[PDB]
Amino acid sequence: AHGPRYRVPFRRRREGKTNYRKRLKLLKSGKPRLVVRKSLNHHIAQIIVYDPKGDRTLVSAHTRELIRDFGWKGHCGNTPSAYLLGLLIGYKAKQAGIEEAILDIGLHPPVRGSSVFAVLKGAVDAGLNVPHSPEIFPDEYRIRGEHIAEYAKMLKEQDEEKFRRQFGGYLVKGLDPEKLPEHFEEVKARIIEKFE
């Protein structure tokens, strides 16, 4: 600020966190918001309702709890983890009694086949009634984890050092990069049994 006429933006706008025009458009619906956010290593899914003194999150689900409880040793920043988190948040919302919600991806661009839409698909399969169009859902093989295993096999066939550098932490965690779809299926079955 360098004068009385300077206009200091909102705190969230300055921090680059909230898109206020999209927020107003979402809040005009009057329905719960399924907020989806992604970091470098994790995913966050929340069910939020509006309040003039500050929004209240009725149901929250962090992908870090997949490592515990059910048990998931895969990287928590990929499409299978996003799908599992979406299923978790959908089942939690259905348990809590929330039947309808509208997706909120914040500042993330709407690129088809992304992790946010993977979370949306997971919630839809869980049972949450979120309006959408199926054309944006990621491909089933990508959701299951076929691409990850395919690149793991390609790297193993190629220079083994490249494969070791790419998936070094998987070996330390004890999970072979192959059979990751099998591990994902096991975790999905465990979650379905727990919530049904």
């Binding site: 921090e15 680059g16 966190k17 500042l107 993330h108």
Partner: protein, 183 residues
């Protein structure tokens, strides 16, 4: 020239590896100043020299002294990053004598020089793309923590401490290649 903070800068870089500068990008421009056969020859020349499709830069405002019009393509531009940029920068710096004048480093360590002819790493005066040679090459440097000011979400500002300077740019360019002259 002479940089009095040489050993201090080297010690700082060794102590903090993430403060070590790196090449943000290398930009090659050719302002032929006209649209047509010469412009196409320059585009073909850049395609062979670099390996990626260049960009036709049009004219801003209409100037009649140069005989240009708004929207008419004028110049050709290419940008390179990564090890390909490193190799091409080595070739371009070896093209001319590996000497850079002191009065060419920007206030933030970036450099800009020019190559008038095709006296460089391998090339030929082939019948096509002949005479369109002559470019200006700008090297933009950066410290690793520079994505913050460029990303969209959670964008912030880089302090003067983390911003580069002319002396550090000269030191890095020395440690990479070349030499500097007092012109």
């Amino acid at each position: 020239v002479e940089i009095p903070n040489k050993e201090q800068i080297l010690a700082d870089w060794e102590a903090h590896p993430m403060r070590r500068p790196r090449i943000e990008k290398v930009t090659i421009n050719i302002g032929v100043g006209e649209s047509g056969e010469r412009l196409t020859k320059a585009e073909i020349m850049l395609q062979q020299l670099t390996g990626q499709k260049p960009i036709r830069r049009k004219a801003k405002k209409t100037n009649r002294d140069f005989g240009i019009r708004r929207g008419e393509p004028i110049a050709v531009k290419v940008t390179l990053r990564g090890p390909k940029a490193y190799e091409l920068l080595k070739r371009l710096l070896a093209a001319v004598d590996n000497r850079l004048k002191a009065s060419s480093f920007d206030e933030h360590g970036n450099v800009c020089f020019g190559i008038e002819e095709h006296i460089n790493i391998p090339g030929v005066e082939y019948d096509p793309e002949i005479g369109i040679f002559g470019m200006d090459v700008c090297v933009t440097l950066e410290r690793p923590g520079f994505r913050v000011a460029r990303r969209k979400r959670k964008r912030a500002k880089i302090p003067t401490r983390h911003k580069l300077t002319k002396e550090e740019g000269m030191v890095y360019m020395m440690e990479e290649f070349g030499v500097e002259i007092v012109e």
